[PDB]
């Protein structure tokens with residue numbers, strides 16, 4: 001009632017309206033007016049910016065004036081729209097955000113499967129609006145004006161079941177539809193995406209040949225000399241010794257296959273890891289049987305492992321199961337040429353020009369690939385390693401870009417959950433008007449935040465905001 005409190009709240013609500021409409025209109029201009037930005041995700045973001053700007057301009061003002069002044073001035077039609085639009089707007093924006101999380105989950109988890117096209121995005125947006133308006137419809141249908149003694153009032157006359165069941169059913173249905181369900185769906189999608197991205201995911205500032213000394217030839221000769229071997233084509237395995245997973249058993253079977261051939265004299269093997277005692281005794285058994293095989297079961301520093309990746313000719317990764325194949329990125333960044341099973345992330349990282357791929361679990365195919373690598377070592381291998389280094393670096397810039405965007409969207413959804421929790425708890429409480437003023441300001445402030453999040457956490461949006469201003 002104090003006029004300053006009223007001027008305070010008038011200034012705050014006007015700040016919400018101007019920041020939300022300016023920022024969201026700027027976002028729609030940024031995505032639509034610039035050709036490169038017309039992606040599927042950005043179309044859904046335009047829908048959310050359209051809904052948030054619309055609800056700000058058409059509802060924040062009247063919610064403030066009618067809340068403080070306790071008098072309806074805008075007629076029956078706008079009483080219905082005032083109680084109707086905000087549900088549909090929240091539905092359109094939050095389910096546009098669900099479309100964004102779903103699109104990233106598709107692009108990351110099943111890249112080969114087709115995402116829907118731009119015009120298909122427009123159809124999905126129209127379906128989003130249909131479901132939004134039809135969910136919001138019952139409330140706008142039951143709003144009405146009561147002309148009365150001192151004032152006109154805008155009230156929702158829910159059907160007169162004495163237990164107030166129909167009203168409570170509608171409110172729980174809306175809250176589930178536009179808060180809990182979308183937050184759970186988006187939470188599963190971005191949790192899957194975030195775990196697989198963080199685990200993907202190599203420190204390129206460390207796994208880098210620049211910290212190695214000398215030519216690769218000098219390093220290979222010094223390394224083999226330290227193991228008691230003389231120069232040869234050098235293969236390395238590093239990983240846990242186990243059965244049915246990291247494939248050291250397939251490599252040992254392949255080593256026994258090569259051991260009877262004359263080409264085996266020209267090969268060197270360095271098997272590194274710890275695990276099954278039988279695989280350890282088998283690898284050690286191969287180590288005493290052949291002078292070109294060396295086994296290291298003790299733990300090594302990562303600086304020494306980087307020394308190995310930069311000295312050996314090839315790294316063998318015969319995994320049965322390899323979700324991420326980070327060891328291949330470590331070898332390729334250091335110029336070792338991978339010979340790996342076509343499983344999991346290894347199939348995604350390695351290409352025809354950047355490694356040698358084989359069927360998982362087939363030792364003869366692996367030995368044949370090792371013989372092919374020996375024949376390839378005859379010719380210069382520098383461009384092959386260059387293609388491997390370029391591939392490992394470019395794959396990491398990808399994963400970094402995806403982690404940056406997905407972190408931004410997580411901030412968007414988090415802002416949504418924070419802004420809407422007090423509101424939904426307030427209206428579902430019945431089943432303190434200063435508290436209503438605060439909760440209403442916080443709930444309707446969410447419309448101004450998305451343009452700020454895009455400007456701060458996304459370089460493309462930052463360039464577009466500096467272009468407009």
Ligand SMILES: COc1ccccc1CN[C@H]1CCCN[C@H]1c1ccccc1
Pocket residue numbers: 083086087090139156170171174175424427428
């Ligand atoms: C900003 O305003 C809104 C924002 C989101 C949803 C709904 C509204 C308006 N609806 C409120 C207002 C009074 C009538 N019902 C209420 C209600 C409360 C909770 C679920 C569903 C409805």
